[PDB]
Design a protein around this ligand. Structure first.
Ligand SMILES: CCCCCCCCCCCCCCCCCC(=O)OC[C@H](COP(=O)([O-])OCC(O)COP(=O)([O-])OC[C@@H](COC(=O)CCCCCCCCCCCCCCCCC)OC(=O)CCCCCCCCCCCCCCCCC)OC(=O)CCCCCCCCCCCCCCCCC
Ligand SMILES: CCCCCCCCCCCCCCCCCC(=O)OC[C@H](COP(=O)([O-])OCC(O)COP(=O)([O-])OC[C@@H](COC(=O)CCCCCCCCCCCCCCCCC)OC(=O)CCCCCCCCCCCCCCCCC)OC(=O)CCCCCCCCCCCCCCCCC
Ligand SMILES: CCCCCCCCCCCCCCCCCC(=O)OC[C@H](COP(=O)([O-])OCC[N+](C)(C)C)OC(=O)CCCCCCCCCCCCCCCCC
Ligand SMILES: CCCCCCCCCCCCO[C@@H]1O[C@H](CO)[C@@H](O[C@H]2O[C@H](CO)[C@@H](O)[C@H](O)[C@H]2O)[C@H](O)[C@H]1O
Ligand SMILES: CCCCCCCCCCCCO[C@@H]1O[C@H](CO)[C@@H](O[C@H]2O[C@H](CO)[C@@H](O)[C@H](O)[C@H]2O)[C@H](O)[C@H]1O
Ligand SMILES: CCCCCCCCCCCCO[C@@H]1O[C@H](CO)[C@@H](O[C@H]2O[C@H](CO)[C@@H](O)[C@H](O)[C@H]2O)[C@H](O)[C@H]1O
Ligand SMILES: CCCCCCCCCCCCO[C@@H]1O[C@H](CO)[C@@H](O[C@H]2O[C@H](CO)[C@@H](O)[C@H](O)[C@H]2O)[C@H](O)[C@H]1O
Ligand SMILES: CCCCCCCCCCCCO[C@@H]1O[C@H](CO)[C@@H](O[C@H]2O[C@H](CO)[C@@H](O)[C@H](O)[C@H]2O)[C@H](O)[C@H]1O
Lengths: 77, 85, 186, 102, 378, 87, 55, 167, 85, 60, 189
């Protein structure tokens, strides 16, 4: 009566959607996460939705030698 | 003092008082006057499957409050950890 | 020249051949695989399913009607699994210097120099943080060596690969100076 | 030693550990047996940072000197807590002068 | 700080506990009045002018009742047992915010606090059922404990999905994050699972058949122990109210009122300094609002600390009350579910869906660059 | 110092136990709560998060031994009908 | 051997990247020059070995 | 003293001993927490070089940077004193309007935009300084300039306009 | 018809939630110096309030003066504890 | 970015205070015990973990 | 002239008494004593639920909320519940578990001295840090307080990336405790 996945793959999927809905659509939703990772991000870069730069979580020290400032000295105090 | 401390003591006072009305005001009569059956194994399974899954979800709560730093690399590891359990 | 080609402390392993990369990206590992690598992976992959069928004929399991078909599926997945790991591990040991890699040193030198002259980052651009790039790199450096216990693959564009990248820049400079003279000559 | 602290930042005694790792790796090899003898004082500082025994010993004598050095000298007028709590405040100049004995 | 901390500590604790206790008393009157309108009868309408004293007489009657429970071989357990069940009922209210930061304890791990106090509920259903002496009833207290632990996984695993969106376990931050949208809208199926899980967690009908079957097998020799005690009734009603406030904190606005002051800004464009306040709308005219009498007074009262706090708590109250209705409506609408069937619902339907959504949600938040920052913002 | 005392309690549960295989189950967990508790208090002292994490993984392995331990004790009781040790 | 060679010399790159106070991390270019010399010497040995034995 | 968060602190230890005369003295910044946030973007428009030099000197000299970087710190507290001095000289009303707003708004910047925009108007006119937030996304309006703030507790009236430098 | 009697208890609960939020917002207002209270306070916000106390004496006090008053240099509070560390 | 433009001023004030109390404690020791005891074998400044305190608080 | 060092109390941003730690130590000890002396295994597990609570509060009191709350959720929440199930279903004759405890007093005396005298030397100085008494001192930092993280966010920043191998092993230990405990208890089908 109830089908067999490896004999009739499409026919099992209809029975499982109808007869085991919570179980079937659990595996469906779980697969959508792997799909959404694969699909939206490239399409986002196609439409020009650039990912935001990361926010600073430490003091942003610039690279290179020190600039040799002149100003705001003890005499100015 | 802190607020959390005064709050527990307050509830503790109220919980004692309802004892006091009962022990003071309710009447108190002094007169206060063996087999084996197998227990079902499903009771054990309820506690065990809870104990393990509850430990498993606990291990994911740090991920939800650290997502921005974890980013893609953290997601992949958490996906692997979610997949195994 | 970035004035710092060795930017991170890296482990030197005693091997018989030149190191191309501590941590090759997955596509570079695939892209450098020689056609023998494909024969060997397929050969190993078919072996687990064929070993299982061989055992059933010589020493039958006496199982019920559908049991062997179920087992054939599982032995088949393990064969595709072990077969791909062996194919990948065969290609990536030339990167590590643990296999004769004369061919891939030339293919590495050309591409990495062709990237320098194109202005490209030598190892590509990472969406991950410089700090997450350093975590990724420490996890995958020489990790195909632990494949029999744990599977890991590099899918991050970090710039920590264990090699002093002065040579790629040096060879780009010497190649640019060669082409410029030819254009000036004619 | 890990490099990760409670507040999301680095660990307090991680600089000492790297100062100890750098010493051992750049002064000791198989060519030189005693090169690791420069790591001894560097290792002491690492063990001090984690445990604080020598600082505890130092601040336990210095505190015993001061407490009986300020136990026998004459006291003129000890500033009350309320006076200290008004120190440096823009409308309590009188209290600050009393605190600093200027 | 302007006055002493202990005074401030005392006023906030009294301001939360006395309204909460009076409210937990009116949910009991309300559940008998609501079930009577749906059952075409009346609720209590005689003890007090509108039955508004029914909770009071019920509680004082039980307090004055004799208690004949076993005091032998367990004196502390009979007396000091249920008392702290009532403490574990009220200890969750100390993290409820009645406006931004307006909580007894503003806790960063506020969510993990209410997950700890909830796992202590299992002891107040386990231990009380340990007093009754009847073999089949004792196993019914274990089955009720089994229902609570299973539906706690439902709640904690589905609370996880809200934390992913907010980035924080602070109840204030979780509500403030909903200024963009209420979590019922994007996490619709998570909300329903949480509400269903929250009925099963409270042991409420239609998930109460395990504790229901005790009364049917009592026999002709022994009886129950929850008899003269109002504790396990205030522990029960207060856990229902608390599961309604937390359900509102997570999926409805919390204390967020949809502000109409934004709408009036968009519609109105004819600002007038003479106080006319003309509006550029089709039903508009030239209003005669009194600048000296009304506008000066109205503007000040809107910015008052008392008024704005009042609306934040009337919002949270209106939302908790709507959910209190949906618990009472659920008890009056369905028959009971058998224990094996509720167990199948939790373990083979609900939790599979939840673990499927635990995969999918962070995957979408990564795909649309929407992982929130987990530093103290908001 | 509390960590060492609570370790002794777990040890002494093994010293005074001739009949309780359940107290042997219990004292192993008291010993685990000492060692986790000691790791945690030293982590606060050194500003290290790895001590906190190591505590977490001790707590997770500790629960798993309880499942395996109470599961095996169930398998034993089914055929025995008693957890008692004749002595 | 009385000398230990780190199996993981990449612990010199360890440390939190957040809430870093200025001056907290040590200047470890003397370390990186050690490892640079080690990689260059080993590259030379093999170079000198499979090029002088390939003829 | 140690940077550890305290759990059972009940007392404060003050040292009235003065800094030695060898080290040049500097008048300290006297603005409170909310005045500093209002003037925060102005300060880093002007003192960024001094602010970055001070943090670089400390990075250059590990474990010894509280000492040996003392001249640079005095340079930062003079640059910031000149911004705080300049804002009071020209924008006192707009400045106090904004920082007193932030006092009652959890010092959250999105909660006082009408006051900030007016201060940005006055500081740009009077001191030619401009609030810039670095590395902001490119496909949308800057958050500090949006007519609508989603997380604001009170709505921004439409007639309150964001300050664009030049319109 | 609408059975407003059954609706009376619900209105009571809404009035109680209103009174808690009403009365708690005002006690905090006065406690914080007749200014709105702070909410999600981290280590930075707490230290910022401590320096506010240093300049004014009140944790919520605010002053825009460019120069700190004399004595400000020595009022920096170093906390002392007996046990935890 | 608003806390970054303030981090150097706030740190500079703390650093002067860390120098003040360290130089004061070194002097307080030289008079009290006659010399200095070295707790670390490096010139690094370690933020103190223990302090010398009076035996009594203010009367209050 | 006046004493340069000044000690005064903290009016509002104060903290907790250290007295509570000495109380919570005492009850933890007292609770632990009753675990290994109680006749009834039900009662011993209750004294265990008490001990786990006191240790949980001790940790919350010293700042370790997430793990202190984790102990609450995990031990009292779930482990002791599984212990209560089994102990309230197994038949227990409370006199067959009772052994002559008075004999083992001398061996309690002996092993208490030897373990205590050795292991205490192994502990570090910071743990045994608690008449001139040393006071611990703390001060503020600004560069390190830019974006402070709660302990659970700090654990999360590294739990899934840098030390993720520990997560793999733990996932497999929990997975083994699922399969193994199910396979040794239930009758299949
Ligand atoms: C995350 C875990 C998700 C697990 C749930 C996946 C759905 C499921 O239970 O599938 C069985 C479910 C039940 O079907 P059935 O025909 O009643 O099962 C009995 C058969 O003998 C079928 O027996 P079988 O061993 O041939 O098939 C079972 C197994 C397929 O197993 C194999 O054939 C090899 C094992 C693959 C392991 C992959 C690891 C990664 O199916 C899977 O779990 C595939 C997952 C991908 O449907 C499938 O077979 C779906 C396969 C796709
Ligand atoms: C213990 C047992 C362990 C067993 C497993 C061993 C795993 C070995 C290591 C894999 C995990 C670590 C790598 C991923 C972490 C990361 O940051 O990725 C870098 C990657 C980009 O980094 P990047 O610095 O730009 O590096 C250059 C990219 O290659 C350029 O990136 P793209 O522009 O090519 O990005 C597109 C790409 C994104 O994917 C990737 O680039 C890497 C992910 C491929 C993993 C393949 C499966 C593992 C074999 O998407 C695809 O091509 C389609 C695949 C999407 C996921 C499908 C579902 C996978 C699991 C199915 C079951 O990040 C992402 O794109 C984020 C999504 C990654 C999701 C990975 C989820 C894995 C979950 C496995 C569960 C079992
Ligand atoms: C605010 C919500 C509660 C209001 C209660 C007001 C008092 C009340 O119900 O009045 C009727 C009550 C009496 O209600 P009652 O319970 O006597 O009503 C009896 C009605 N029959 C005859 C049908 C049974 O008036 C009083 O005597 C006042 C008592 C005040 C107690 C404290 C409140
Ligand atoms: C790719 C396709 C999606 C992956 C599969 C989605 C999940 C669908 C439901 C999974 C189980 O699907 C089905 O469930 C029912 C449960 O009664 C079982 O079906 C069968 O179970 C046993 C056999 O073991 C029989 O005695 C029974 O008559 C029959 O119902 C099987 O377990 C499985 O055939
Ligand atoms: C925890 C806070 C401190 C405790 C507060 C509560 C104190 C409770 C004790 C005082 C009230 C005692 O309550 C009262 O007890 C006595 C004795 O048991 C009962 O007395 C009853 O039994 C006694 C037995 O000797 C008879 O002689 C007596 O005639 C009869 O009335 C009362 O029916 C009961 O109402
Ligand atoms: C009773 C004792 C039991 C001992 C159990 C362990 C025994 C281990 C035996 C295997 C030792 C290694 O055996 C080795 O296998 C690898 C497999 O690629 C091969 O080694 C080869 O590796 C790569 C190619 O892959 C070549 O570049 C390399 O030059 C060559 O050595 C050789 O076949 C053999 O040198
Ligand atoms: C104030 C703090 C708490 C102190 C104690 C307060 C009293 C607690 C018990 C009363 C609260 C309501 O409790 C609930 O009452 C209703 C009657 O209205 C009962 O309902 C019962 O009678 C109704 C009458 O129509 C039937 O439809 C229903 O089938 C039957 O079970 C419920 O069985 C009981 O659970
Ligand atoms: C997931 C986050 C959760 C946050 C909120 C957590 C709140 C936890 C509060 C626990 C308070 C006690 O919890 C509550 O106890 C009472 C008394 O034991 C139980 O109530 C029990 O006794 C009453 C009679 O008095 C019965 O009508 C009820 O059917 C029965 O189950 C409730 O079923 C339980 O929910």
């Amino acid at each position: 009566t109830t089908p067999r996945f490896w004999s009739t793959p499409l026919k099992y999927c209809r029975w499982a959607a109808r007869e085991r809905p919570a179980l079937f659509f659990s595996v469906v939703i779980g697969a959508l996460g792997p799909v959404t990772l694969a699909t939206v991000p490239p399409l986002r870069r196609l439409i020009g939705d650039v990912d935001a730069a990361p926010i600073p979580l430490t003091y942003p020290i610039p690279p290179g030698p020190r600039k040799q400032l002149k100003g705001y000295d003890d005499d100015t105090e | 003092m802190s607020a959390m401390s005064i709050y527990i003591i307050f509830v503790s006072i109220i919980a004692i008082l309802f004892l006091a009305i009962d022990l003071i005001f309710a009447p108190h009569n002094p007169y206060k006057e063996q087999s084996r059956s197998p227990f079902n194994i499903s009771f054990f399974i309820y506690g065990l499957v809870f104990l393990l899954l509850d430990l498993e979800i606990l291990l994911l709560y740090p991920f939800a409050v650290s997502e921005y730093v974890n980013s893609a690399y953290g997601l992949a590891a958490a996906l692997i950890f979610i997949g195994i359990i | 020249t970035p004035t710092q080609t060795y930017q991170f402390p890296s482990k030197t392993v005693k091997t018989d051949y030149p190191l191309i990369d501590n941590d090759p990206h997955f596509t570079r590992v695939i892209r450098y695989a020689r056609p023998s690598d494909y024969a060997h992976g397929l050969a190993a992959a078919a072996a687990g399913p064929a070993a299982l069928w061989l055992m059933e004929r010589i020493s039958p399991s006496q199982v019920g009607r559908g049991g062997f078909a179920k087992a054939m599926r599982l032995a088949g997945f393990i064969g595709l699994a072990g077969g791909f790991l062996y194919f990948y591990q065969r290609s990536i040991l030339r990167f590590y210097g643990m296999s004769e890699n004369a061919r891939e040193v030339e293919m590495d030198m050309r591409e990495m120099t062709d990237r320098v002259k194109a202005g490209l980052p030598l190892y590509g651009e990472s969406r991950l943080s410089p700090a997450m790039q350093g975590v990724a790199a420490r996890q995958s450096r020489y990790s195909a060596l632990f494949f029999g216990v744990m599977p890991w693959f590099n899918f991050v564009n970090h710039n920590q690969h264990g090699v002093d990248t002065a040579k790629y820049y040096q060879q780009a400079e010497r190649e640019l100076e060669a082409e410029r003279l030819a254009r000036e000559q004619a | 030693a890990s490099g990760y602290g409670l507040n999301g930042g680095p660990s307090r005694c991680f600089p000492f550990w790297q100062e100890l790792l750098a010493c051992y790796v750049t002064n000791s090899s198989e060519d030189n047996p005693d090169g690791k003898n420069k790591c001894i004082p560097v290792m002491e500082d690492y063990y001090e940072c984690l445990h604080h025994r020598k600082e505890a010993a130092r601040v336990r004598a210095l505190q015993a000197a001061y407490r009986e050095a300020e136990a026998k000298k004459l006291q003129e007028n000890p500033p009350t807590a309320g006076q200290i709590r008004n120190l440096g405040l823009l409308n309590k100049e009188e209290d600050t002068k009393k605190v600093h004995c200027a | 700080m302007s006055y002493s901390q202990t005074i401030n500590s005392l006023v906030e604790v009294v301001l939360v506990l006395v309204p909460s206790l009076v409210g937990i008393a009116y949910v009991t009157v309300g559940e008998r009045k609501t079930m009577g309108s749906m059952q075409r009868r009346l609720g209590p309408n005689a003890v007090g002018i509108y039955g508004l004293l029914q909770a009071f007489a019920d509680a004082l009657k039980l307090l004055l009742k004799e208690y004949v429970g076993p005091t032998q071989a367990n004196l502390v357990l009979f007396f000091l047992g249920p008392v702290i069940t009532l403490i574990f009922s009220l200890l969750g209210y100390a993290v409820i915010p009645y406006g931004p930061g307006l909580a007894v304890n503003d806790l960063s791990t506020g969510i993990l606090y209410m997950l700890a106090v909830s796992s202590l509920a299992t002891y107040g259903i386990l231990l009380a059922g340990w007093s009754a002496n009847s073999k089949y009833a004792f196993l019914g207290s274990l089955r009720s404990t089994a229902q609570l632990i299973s539906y706690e996984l439902v709640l904690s695993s589905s609370i996880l999905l809200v934390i992913m969106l907010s980035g924080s376990l602070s109840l204030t931050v979780i509500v403030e994050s909903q200024r963009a949208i209420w979590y019922i809208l994007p996490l619709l199926p998570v909300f329903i699972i949480f509400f269903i899980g929250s009925v099963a967690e409270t042991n409420r009908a239609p998930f109460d058949l395990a504790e229901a079957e005790s009364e049917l097998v009592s026999g002709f020799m022994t009886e129950h122990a929850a008899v003269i005690f109002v504790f396990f009734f205030l522990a029960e009603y207060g856990s229902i109210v608390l599961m309604c406030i937390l359900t509102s904190i997570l999926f409805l606005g919390g204390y967020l009122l949809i502000s109409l002051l934004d709408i009036i800004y968009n519609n109105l464009l004819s600002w007038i300094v003479i106080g006319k306040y003309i509006i550029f709308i089709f039903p508009f005219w030239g209003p005669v609002f009194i600048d000296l009498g009304l506008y000066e007074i109205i503007s000040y009262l809107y910015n008052a600390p008392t008024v704005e706090g009042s609306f934040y708590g009337l919002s949270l109250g209106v939302k908790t009350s709507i959910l209190i209705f949906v618990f009472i409506w659920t008890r009056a609408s369905f028959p009971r579910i058998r224990f094996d069937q509720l167990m199948s619902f939790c373990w083979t339907v609900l939790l599979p869906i939840l673990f499927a959504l635990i995969v999918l949600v962070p995957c979408i938040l990564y795909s649309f660059n929407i992982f929130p920052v987990n530093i103290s913002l908001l | 110092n509390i960590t060492l005392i609570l370790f002794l309690i777990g040890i002494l549960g093994f010293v005074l136990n001739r009949k309780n295989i359940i107290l042997m189950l219990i004292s192993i967990e008291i010993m685990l709560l000492s060692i986790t508790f000691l790791i945690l208090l030293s982590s606060l002292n050194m500003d290290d998060i790895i001590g906190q994490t190591y505590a977490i993984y001790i707590i997770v392995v500790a629960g798993a031994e309880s499942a395996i331990g109470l599961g095996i004790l169930v398998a034993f009781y089914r055929l025995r009908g008693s957890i008692a040790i004749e002595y | 051997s009385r000398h230990i060679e780190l199996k993981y010399p990449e612990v010199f790159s360890h440390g939190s990247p957040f809430n870093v106070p200025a001056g907290f991390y040590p200047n470890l270019d003397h370390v990186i020059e050690h490892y640079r010399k080690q990689h260059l010497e080993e590259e030379e040995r093999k170079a000198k070995k499979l090029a002088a034995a390939a003829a | 003293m140690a940077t550890r968060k305290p759990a059972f602190n009940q007392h404060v230890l003050l040292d009235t001993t003065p800094l030695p005369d060898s080290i040049p003295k500097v008048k300290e910044i006297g603005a409170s927490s909310a005045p500093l946030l209002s003037a925060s973007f102005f300060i880093g428009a002007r003192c960024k070089d001094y602010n970055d030099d001070y943090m670089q000197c400390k990075n250059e000299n590990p474990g010894r940077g509280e000492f040996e970087c003392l001249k640079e710190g005095r340079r930062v507290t003079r640059c910031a004193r000149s911004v705080l001095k300049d804002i009071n000289t020209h924008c006192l009303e707009q400045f106090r309007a904004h920082w007193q707003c932030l006092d009652n708004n959890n010092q959250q910047l999105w909660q006082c935009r009408p006051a900030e925009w007016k201060l940005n108007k006055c500081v740009y006119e009077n001191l030619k300084l401009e609030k810039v937030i670095p590395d902001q996304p490119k496909n949308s309006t800057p958050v500090h300039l949006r007519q609508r703030q989603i997380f604001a507790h009170h709505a921004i009236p439409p007639w309150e306009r964001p300050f664009i430098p030049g319109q | 018809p609408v059975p407003f009697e059954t609706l009376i208890p619900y209105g009571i609960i809404i009035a109680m939630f209103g009174v808690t939020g009403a009365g708690m917002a005002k006690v905090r207002h006065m406690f914080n110096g007749d200014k709105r209270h702070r909410w999600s306070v981290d280590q930075w916000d707490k230290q910022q309030m401590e320096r506010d106390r240093r300049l004014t004496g009140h944790l919520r006090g605010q002053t825009d003066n460019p120069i700190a008053p004399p004595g400000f240099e020595f009022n920096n509070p170093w906390k002392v504890x007996x046990x935890x560390x | 970015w608003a806390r970054i433009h303030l981090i150097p001023l706030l740190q500079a004030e703390e650093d002067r205070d860390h120098v003040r109390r360290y130089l004061a404690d070194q002097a307080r020791e030289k008079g009290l015990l006659g010399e200095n005891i070295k707790v670390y074998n490096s010139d690094r400044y370690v933020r103190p973990t223990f302090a010398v305190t009076p035996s009594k608080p203010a009367q209050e | 002239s006046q004493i340069s060092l000044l000690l005064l109390k903290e009016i509002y941003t104060n903290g907790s008494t250290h007295i509570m730690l000495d109380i919570l130590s005492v009850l933890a000890v007292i609770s632990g004593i009753c675990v290994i002396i109680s006749k009834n295994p039900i009662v011993s597990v209750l004294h265990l639920i008490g001990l786990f609570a006191y240790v949980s509060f001790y940790l919350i009191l010293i700042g370790l909320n997430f793990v202190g709350l984790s102990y609450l959720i995990v031990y009292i929440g779930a482990v002791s519940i599984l212990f209560l199930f089994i102990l309230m279903l197994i038949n227990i004759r409370t006199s067959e578990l009772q052994s002559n405890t008075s004999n083992s007093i001398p061996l309690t005396i002996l092993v208490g001295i030897i373990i205590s005298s050795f292991l205490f030397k192994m502990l570090p100085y910071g743990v045994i840090i608690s008449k001139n008494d040393l006071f611990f001192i703390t001060s503020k930092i600004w560069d390190g307080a830019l974006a402070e993280n709660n302990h659970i966010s700090s654990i999360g920043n590294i739990m899934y990336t840098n030390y993720n191998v520990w997560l793999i092993l733990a996932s497999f230990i929990l997975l083994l405790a699922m399969v193994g405990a199910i396979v040794i208890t239930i009758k299949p089908r």
